[PDB]
């Protein structure tokens, strides 16, 4: 009754046979902004089923020796469907997001996964390895779209904090003896109630594998991770043409 | 008007009780009994543990009066830490005719700016104090002109110049023989909380090289100028510092994130040393031993 | 005018004082506050999140940083054998350096309460074993045995469906509050020992891997209270913050 | 330093070369991707011959 | 107490042992403020809350 | 006497106190008022009196000032020209500077609400045509053609008896006050675009001038409300003033 | 031409969402844009010069003569206030001397 | 309270929040005054006001 | 502000004076104490054993 | 001027005159000249027994 | 990624062996006749 699960929301679902459980980022569902909170005055519009599908992204494969990755949200989706239409058109925004990322295998695999939110995910250098020039991340490293990037320095999460007190923002494991999928629902949090889309990203999904991949030879070599997630109660304002970026 | 059903039909979990002392410790006892088990969680739910003290040892009643209030916000960000020094000094390079415009960015030291970038979003009122002197630490008899520049406001370019007027600027006059001036400073940010994190540009277009130096800086943060010259036309003769302190009344605090491990290098950016990543703690030879 | 004399401790400058300042602004609204998500009343919901403690704090190197999260088990040819050991105070500089439990304890000069540490098994499903995780209570040393390590507070910990299992460290002290054990006379306030043993073995079928990796995770109970707080003792600033 | 040399590009035929020995795979094949380059740029002689 | 409502903690129902002696609030004390946490919504955030005593995956 | 210690603060001359000082006059009743008319009695009373917008901002020599006041239309051979454009943000250097209310927005750090945009056709009365006026919200970049700024917020106006139209410039924001836009990382708060689009022509009979004016008035809505005041970015001084 | 301010609304122009709006307007008021202390006056006496060598200076009250609290206060024809005028005196380089 | 009516501010129906330490008011503090505001006599002050949803010609 | 005259006996330290001074700890609730035996209350308990 | 300053058990002694010690960010710390009256602060009961 | 975009379902092997696909009924009009080549392709259901 909590390792078999469903979460059908718009014209899509996903099942999951094998859960783990769904937590719910910091306590509280997405939520439309109230009346105490906004600050716009022309009326949002709210596509309620066109823009809160299971989106499913990438594939990216996890081999013995990886380090991690990362999604910037929400500019996974300004290239994808109707909330990339949405999202281009209107310069306001704000959504919730339902964060499922499958990663399954066999009964003789193991290792385990970290995969965790945490807002205002950014991204320091190596400052020129020694530490004394002050380069910043280029805008691939700081918004890389569908396609994810990889941790160069994973303990310290290209940001300077470690990883092992990753796990206070939310997260959810992914062990591979005992589930293979984890969803996470984060609402929208952002200071100001609603923002634009293409500048600013609320968070970042971080997956690591903490305790690598292990597999006897003679097993499937090819063990992916792809992440599907879901724009819950999403809402558009302030209509003029298409920006890109 | 509409006959549709579709149109006609289209919240926290969690619940903040109050508790000042730290839980009690009930009386519990052996048990052999199978079915339940209070030791064995599931950590990769992403839950931390609710096993207690009484359901893993035989415990006793322990009235825990133990208050929890030196742990709140207000009670630890409350202390005035360092967060500014300006430097005015006889002759040199930096500021050589007895002016100096510092802009407020509380992140240039590392024992205020550990703390609260604990959390991501933080909204509180404060009260900075400018304990000025002289770099030999002597207090000589010299008059200051503190003022605060509101982003749009005239930055004044020199000693003797017209934005020192202050017809609507707040200002302040304390010569050194005085004690520290302070004044307290409300939150004044167009965001509801100060991000001390802003993972984004703050303007749009494409963006090259040559504008990365916008990435991480959000105008809802940067408030302003301080600035802080020697009232007179004439240069004074006396060498000062200004250290400011700051502390935090009134904070709220939104959204916990990890503290930083590795050393600080920049402001407003957390760039790190790159062959030089430290481990975040000591370490041993063997993992058997001590 | 009105009599008054002024006392000492006039004109000073104390940085913890909760006095009234003039406003630089008179009669100024901020902004009106958005209901924004996951807000602290306390600090105290932040040392109850389980956290990763790193257990393996031996590798130091910048290539193998991460193998400090996880510790190994492996299928032992024999009786009872040491899989790990480590101090149980969060104060003493080791493996609780890595835990907010451990961070947050660093800014507060002396804490109380049981606190509770959790190993996720992160093996094959077909692999099996009993681990036996025991604290011992301060001043008995550090255990030669595995008979030895039995005397005092331990769990057995089957690997099963369930994945991971709860080592509650209990409140044991001679003191109310006790501070961060450092050596020296401040080694009157450790807290004691975990110490991590085989209790029977790690057996696997052919085609599973013989090394499994446990991850210790650490957080507090709810009895956890801390005071006197102070500056942290690590400085993180070598020159000049440009 | 007027005279425009119109031929391959060198880096951007260097990286590739890195992309099939895995010297940073996965940071440069992210580089030409959401960079869109050109095969065949135009640049100054002391450009092309003395760094650019 | 004719002061302005101008903290930068108001948001709460009860209000605070701060005393001022300005015009505006935010001028005034820090206070004792309300000791109630909640350590539920970063302890264990899930959607269906599993008790202590049960098995977390049934 | 009574025991007072002296917290700092002490001995400063904050200039926006607002403290009592010692009276130079005992007991002088000032001379009583009259009802004098039009008192203010708030700020945003002016900030919502409509008032000529400079958007012909361009001739600047001494015979030609008057030149800035209003901006020309005139009958185009074609399809949808651009007639003016400018920045819909009063804190900005440029067409709103001469404005009552952007100028007192240049005494306050930070403003918010909708504001309106008049426009007064002053050409012949047998002279009609339909201009489009479009406000562009931020992020969207100057309109290349009609067809772009349609898009946006945007008023079809006809030439009538009824000489003039608001453009009203909606509250479209991020964030609830919104500081004064300049060039740099203060350019995230731009306010947008304001483009004014030919939509069918400027068609006369014969006999009437072929080149017609319109004059922009501007001010705020009920809604404008203003904070942290400061001051103002021009200084109308070089010399001593004799 | 009626020479009226528009009374037009955003309601009436867009279609709008109900927006409390809580922004206060207490910051525009007149004792608040004019109660800061600003400089309109400056008193020189100087050992030996021209102005004022012996160490007295009458400055007949004109507030006209520094131009950022001059332009706020320009802004209206009439105004009725009381004042409260502080006078910060120290030597030319800055310091104070017992005097 | 026992002060004269010396202020500059005398003239309205209600008093404000100003502390005063001296006989005289016009050395009390500035207060907090009335919000009230009046924009139809500087934005609208025609003789007949006519509304917003009418044509103003008619 | 509020008038104030310093009268003499200001700016000393008298070693016996019995006055408030600032707290360096907001809100530090001490340890709880323990029934000791024999609390003494008075040093007159002292004098006549 | 001086700066005092109260080093817990577990905070960092400062070992220097311009050591980065003295930013103060959690310890309480008085900042007073010696033309002020001697500075007086009070201190609570803070043993752990 | 581009049939992600339609009505679709994560279907993942378990001790439950099936899923069922559901095929939901979008159409422009009330009966749809039988789709062959040519003008009667206008009444396509679509592919999975
Ligand atoms: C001129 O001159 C020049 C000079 O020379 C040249 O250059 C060249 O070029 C070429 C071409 O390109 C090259 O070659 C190539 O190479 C490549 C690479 O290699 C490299 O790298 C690798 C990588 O690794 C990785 O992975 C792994 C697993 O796999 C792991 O373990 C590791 O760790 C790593 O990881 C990393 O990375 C990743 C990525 O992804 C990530 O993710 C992570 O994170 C990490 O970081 C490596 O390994 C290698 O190494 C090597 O070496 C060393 C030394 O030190 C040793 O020790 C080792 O062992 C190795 O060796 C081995 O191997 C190799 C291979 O690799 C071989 O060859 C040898 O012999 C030995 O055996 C390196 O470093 C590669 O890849 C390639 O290969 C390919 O091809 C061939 C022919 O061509 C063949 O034969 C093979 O087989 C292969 O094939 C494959 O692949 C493909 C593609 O991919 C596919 O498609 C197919 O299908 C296949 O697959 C299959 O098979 C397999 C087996 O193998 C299996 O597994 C699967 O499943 C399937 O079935 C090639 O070779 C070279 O390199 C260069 N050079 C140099 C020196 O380098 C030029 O060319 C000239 N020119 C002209 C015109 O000619
Ligand atoms: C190698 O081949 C490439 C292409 O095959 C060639 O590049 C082209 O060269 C021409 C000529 O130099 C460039 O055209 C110029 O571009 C500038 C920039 O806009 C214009 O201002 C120039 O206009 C002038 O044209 C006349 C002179 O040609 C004058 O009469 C006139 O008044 C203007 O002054 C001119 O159009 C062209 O831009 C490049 N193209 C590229 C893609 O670089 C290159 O020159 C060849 N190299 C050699 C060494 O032959
Ligand atoms: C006579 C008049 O005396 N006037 C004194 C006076 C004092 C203070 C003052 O404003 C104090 C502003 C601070 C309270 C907050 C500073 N903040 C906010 C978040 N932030 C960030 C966020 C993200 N990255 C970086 N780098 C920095 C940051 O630095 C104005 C005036
Ligand atoms: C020990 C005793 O300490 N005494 C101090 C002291 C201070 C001030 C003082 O009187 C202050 C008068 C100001 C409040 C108003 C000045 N005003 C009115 C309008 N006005 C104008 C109008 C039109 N053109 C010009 N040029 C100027 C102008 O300049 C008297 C005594």
Same mark, same amino acid.
């Given at each position: 009754?909590?390792?078999?699960?469903?979460?059908?929301?718009?014209?899509?679902?996903?099942?999951?046979?094998?859960?783990?459980?769904?937590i719910?980022g910091?306590?509280?569902?997405?939520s439309?902004?109230?009346?105490?909170?906004?600050?716009?005055?022309?009326?949002?519009?709210?596509?309620?089923?066109?823009?809160?599908?299971?989106?499913?992204?990438?594939?990216?494969?996890?081999?013995?020796?990886?380090?991690?990755?990362?999604?910037?949200?929400?500019?996974?989706?300004?290239?994808?469907?109707?909330?990339?239409?949405?999202?281009?058109?209107?310069?306001?925004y704000?959504?919730?997001?339902?964060?499922?990322?499958?990663?399954?295998?066999?009964?003789?695999?193991?290792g385990?996964?970290?995969?965790?939110?945490?807002?205002?995910?950014?991204?320091?250098?190596?400052?020129?390895?020694?530490?004394?020039?002050?380069?910043?991340?280029?805008?691939?490293?700081?918004?890389?779209?569908?396609?994810?990037?990889?941790?160069?320095?994973?303990?310290?999460?290209?940001?300077?904090?470690?990883?092992?007190?990753?796990?206070?923002?939310?997260?959810?494991?992914?062990?591979?003896?005992?589930?293979?999928?984890?969803?996470?629902?984060?609402?929208?949090?952002?200071?100001?109630?609603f923002?634009?889309?293409?500048?600013?990203?609320?968070?970042?999904?971080?997956?690591?594998?903490?305790?690598?991949?292990?597999?006897?030879?003679?097993?499937?070599?090819?063990?992916?991770?792809?992440?599907?997630?879901?724009?819950?109660?999403?809402?558009?304002?302030?209509?003029?043409?298409?920006?890109?970026? | 008007?509409?006959?549709?059903?579709?149109?006609?039909?289209?919240?926290?979990?969690?619940?903040?009780?109050?508790?000042?002392?730290?839980?009690?410790?009930?009386?519990?006892?052996?048990?052999?009994?199978?079915?339940?088990?209070?030791?064995?969680?599931?950590?990769?739910?992403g839950?931390?543990?609710?096993?207690?003290?009484?359901?893993?040892?035989?415990?006793?009643?322990?009235?825990?009066?133990?208050?929890?209030?030196?742990?709140?916000?207000?009670?630890?960000?409350?202390?005035?830490?360092?967060?500014?020094?300006?430097?005015?000094?006889?002759?040199?390079?930096?500021?050589?005719?007895?002016?100096?415009?510092?802009?407020?960015?509380?992140?240039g030291?590392?024992?205020?700016?550990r703390?609260?970038?604990?959390?991501?979003?933080?909204?509180?009122?404060?009260?900075?104090?400018?304990?000025?002197?002289?770099?030999?630490?002597?207090?000589?008899?010299?008059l200051?002109?503190?003022?605060?520049?509101?982003?749009?406001?005239?930055?004044?370019?020199?000693?003797?110049?017209?934005?020192?007027q202050?017809?609507?600027?707040?200002?302040?006059?304390?010569?050194?023989?005085?004690?520290?001036?302070?004044?307290?400073?409300?939150?004044?940010?167009?965001?509801?909380?100060?991000?001390?994190?802003?993972?984004?540009?703050?303007?749009?277009?494409?963006?090259?090289?040559?504008?990365?130096?916008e990435?991480?800086?959000?105008?809802?943060?940067?408030?302003?100028?301080?600035?802080?010259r020697?009232?007179?036309?004439?240069?004074?003769?006396?060498?000062?510092?200004?250290?400011?302190y700051?502390?935090?009344?009134?904070?709220?605090?939104?959204?916990?994130?990890?503290?930083?491990?590795?050393?600080?290098?920049?402001?407003?950016?957390?760039?790190?040393?790159?062959?030089?990543?430290?481990?975040?703690?000591?370490?041993?030879?063997?993992?058997?031993?001590? | 005018?009105?009599?008054?004399?002024?006392?000492?401790?006039?004109?000073?400058?104390?940085?913890?004082?909760?006095?009234?300042?003039?406003?630089?602004?008179?009669?100024?609204?901020?902004?009106?506050?958005?209901?924004?998500?996951?807000?602290?009343?306390?600090?105290?919901?932040?040392?109850?999140?389980?956290?990763?403690?790193?257990v393996?704090?031996?590798?130091?190197?910048?290539?193998?940083?991460?193998?400090?999260?996880?510790?190994?088990?492996?299928?032992?040819?024999?009786?009872?054998?040491?899989?790990?050991?480590?101090?149980?105070?969060?104060?003493?500089?080791?493996?609780?350096?890595?835990?907010m439990?451990?961070?947050?304890?660093?800014?507060?000069?002396?804490?109380?309460?049981?606190?509770?540490?959790?190993?996720?098994?992160?093996?094959?499903?077909?692999?099996?074993?009993?681990?036996?995780?025991?604290?011992?209570?301060?001043?008995?040393?550090?255990?030669?045995?595995?008979?030895?390590?039995?005397?005092?507070?331990?769990?057995?910990?089957?690997?099963?469906?369930?994945?991971?299992?709860?080592?509650?460290?209990?409140?044991?002290?001679?003191?109310?509050?006790?501070?961060?054990?450092?050596?020296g006379?401040?080694?009157?306030?450790?807290?004691?020992?975990?110490?991590?043993?085989?209790?029977?073995?790690?057996?696997?079928?052919?085609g599973?891997?013989?090394?499994?990796?446990?991850?210790?995770?650490?957080?507090?109970?709810?009895?956890?209270?801390?005071?006197?707080?102070?500056?942290?003792?690590?400085?993180?600033?070598?020159?000049?913050?440009? | 330093?007027?005279?425009?040399?119109?031929?391959?590009?060198?880096?951007?035929?260097?990286?590739?070369?890195?992309? !099939?020995?895995? #010297?940073?795979?996965?940071?440069?094949?992210?580089? %030409?991707?959401? @960079?869109? !380059?050109?095969? #065949?740029?135009?640049?100054?002689?002391?450009?092309? %011959?003395?760094? @650019? | 107490?004719?002061?302005?409502?101008?903290?930068?903690?108001?948001?709460?129902?009860?209000?605070?042992?701060?005393?001022?002696?300005?015009?505006?609030?935010?001028?005034?004390?820090?206070?004792?403020?309300?000791?109630?946490?909640?350590?539920?919504?970063?302890?264990?955030?899930?959607?269906?809350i599993?008790?202590?005593?049960?098995?977390?995956?049934?």
């Amino acid at each position: 009754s909590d390792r078999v699960a469903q979460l059908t929301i718009g014209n899509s679902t996903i099942t999951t046979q094998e859960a783990a459980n769904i937590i719910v980022g910091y306590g509280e569902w997405p939520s439309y902004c109230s009346d105490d909170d906004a600050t716009a005055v022309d009326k949002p519009t709210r596509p309620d089923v066109s823009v809160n599908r299971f989106y499913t992204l990438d594939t990216k494969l996890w081999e013995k020796s990886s380090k991690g990755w990362y999604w910037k949200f929400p500019d996974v989706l300004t290239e994808t469907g109707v909330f990339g239409q949405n999202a281009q058109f209107h310069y306001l925004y704000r959504s919730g997001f339902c964060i499922h990322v499958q990663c399954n295998a066999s009964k003789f695999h193991q290792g385990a996964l970290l995969v965790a939110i945490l807002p205002e995910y950014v991204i320091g250098t190596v400052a020129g390895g020694t530490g004394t020039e002050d380069s910043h991340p280029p805008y691939i490293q700081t918004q890389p779209g569908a396609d994810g990037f990889e941790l160069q320095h994973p303990y310290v999460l290209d940001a300077g904090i470690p990883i092992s007190q990753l796990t206070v923002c939310p997260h959810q494991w992914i062990n591979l003896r005992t589930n293979n999928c984890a969803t996470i629902i984060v609402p929208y949090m952002n200071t100001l109630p609603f923002d634009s889309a293409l500048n600013h990203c609320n968070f970042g999904l971080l997956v690591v594998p903490i305790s690598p991949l292990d597999f006897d030879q003679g097993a499937t070599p090819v063990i992916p991770i792809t992440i599907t997630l879901a724009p819950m109660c999403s809402e558009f304002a302030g209509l003029r043409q298409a920006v890109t970026q | 008007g509409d006959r549709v059903a579709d149109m006609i039909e289209s919240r926290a979990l969690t619940q903040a009780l109050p508790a000042p002392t730290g839980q009690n410790t009930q009386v519990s006892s052996h048990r052999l009994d199978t079915g339940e088990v209070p030791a064995l969680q599931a950590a990769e739910i992403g839950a931390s543990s609710n096993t207690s003290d009484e359901s893993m040892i035989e415990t006793r009643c322990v009235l825990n009066s133990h208050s929890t209030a030196e742990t709140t916000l207000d009670s630890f960000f409350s202390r005035a830490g360092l967060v500014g020094e300006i430097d005015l000094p006889l002759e040199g390079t930096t500021n050589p005719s007895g002016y100096a415009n510092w802009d407020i960015d509380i992140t240039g030291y590392a024992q205020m700016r550990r703390k609260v970038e604990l959390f991501t979003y933080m909204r509180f009122d404060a009260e900075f104090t400018f304990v000025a002197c002289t770099p030999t630490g002597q207090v000589v008899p010299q008059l200051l002109q503190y003022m605060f520049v509101p982003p749009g406001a005239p930055k004044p370019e020199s000693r003797e110049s017209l934005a020192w007027q202050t017809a609507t600027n707040p200002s302040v006059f304390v010569k050194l023989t005085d004690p520290p001036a302070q004044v307290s400073v409300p939150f004044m940010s167009p965001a509801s909380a100060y991000q001390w994190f802003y993972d984004g540009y703050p303007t749009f277009g494409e963006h090259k090289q040559e504008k990365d130096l916008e990435y991480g800086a959000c105008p809802n943060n940067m408030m302003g100028t301080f600035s802080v010259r020697t009232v007179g036309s004439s240069k004074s003769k006396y060498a000062l510092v200004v250290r400011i302190y700051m502390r935090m009344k009134h904070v709220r605090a939104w959204i916990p994130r990890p503290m930083r491990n590795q050393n600080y290098l920049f402001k407003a950016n957390p760039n790190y040393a790159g062959d030089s990543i430290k481990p975040t703690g000591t370490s041993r030879n063997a993992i058997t031993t001590l | 005018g009105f009599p008054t004399e002024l006392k000492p401790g006039t004109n000073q400058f104390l940085t913890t004082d909760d006095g009234v300042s003039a406003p630089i602004l008179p009669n100024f609204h901020p902004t009106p506050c958005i209901h924004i998500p996951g807000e602290v009343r306390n600090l105290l919901e932040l040392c109850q999140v389980e956290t990763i403690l790193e257990v393996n704090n031996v590798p130091t190197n910048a290539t193998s940083l991460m193998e400090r999260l996880r510790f190994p088990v492996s299928a032992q040819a024999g009786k009872g054998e040491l899989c790990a050991v480590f101090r149980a105070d969060p104060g003493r500089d080791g493996p609780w350096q890595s835990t907010m439990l451990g961070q947050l304890c660093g800014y507060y000069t002396q804490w109380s309460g049981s606190l509770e540490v959790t190993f996720m098994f992160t093996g094959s499903f077909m692999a099996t074993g009993k681990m036996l995780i025991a604290y011992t209570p301060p001043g008995g040393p550090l255990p030669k045995d595995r008979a030895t390590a039995m005397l005092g507070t331990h769990v057995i910990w089957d690997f099963g469906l369930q994945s991971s299992v709860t080592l509650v460290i209990p409140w044991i002290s001679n003191t109310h509050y006790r501070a961060h054990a450092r050596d020296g006379v401040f080694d009157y306030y450790t807290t004691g020992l975990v110490s991590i043993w085989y209790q029977t073995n790690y057996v696997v079928p052919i085609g599973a891997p013989n090394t499994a990796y446990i991850i210790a995770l650490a957080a507090a109970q709810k009895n956890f209270t801390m005071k006197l707080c102070k500056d942290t003792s690590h400085i993180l600033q070598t020159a000049s913050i440009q | 330093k007027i005279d425009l040399i119109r031929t391959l590009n060198i880096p951007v035929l260097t990286v590739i070369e890195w992309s !099939q020995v895995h #010297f940073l795979r996965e940071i440069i094949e992210a580089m %030409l991707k959401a @960079y869109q !380059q050109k095969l #065949f740029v135009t640049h100054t002689v002391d450009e092309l %011959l003395w760094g @650019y | 107490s004719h002061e302005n409502s101008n903290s930068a903690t108001e948001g709460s129902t009860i209000n605070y042992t701060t005393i001022n002696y300005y015009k505006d609030s935010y001028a005034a004390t820090a206070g004792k403020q309300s000791l109630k946490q909640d350590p539920d919504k970063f302890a264990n955030p899930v959607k269906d809350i599993f008790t202590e005593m049960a098995a977390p995956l049934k």
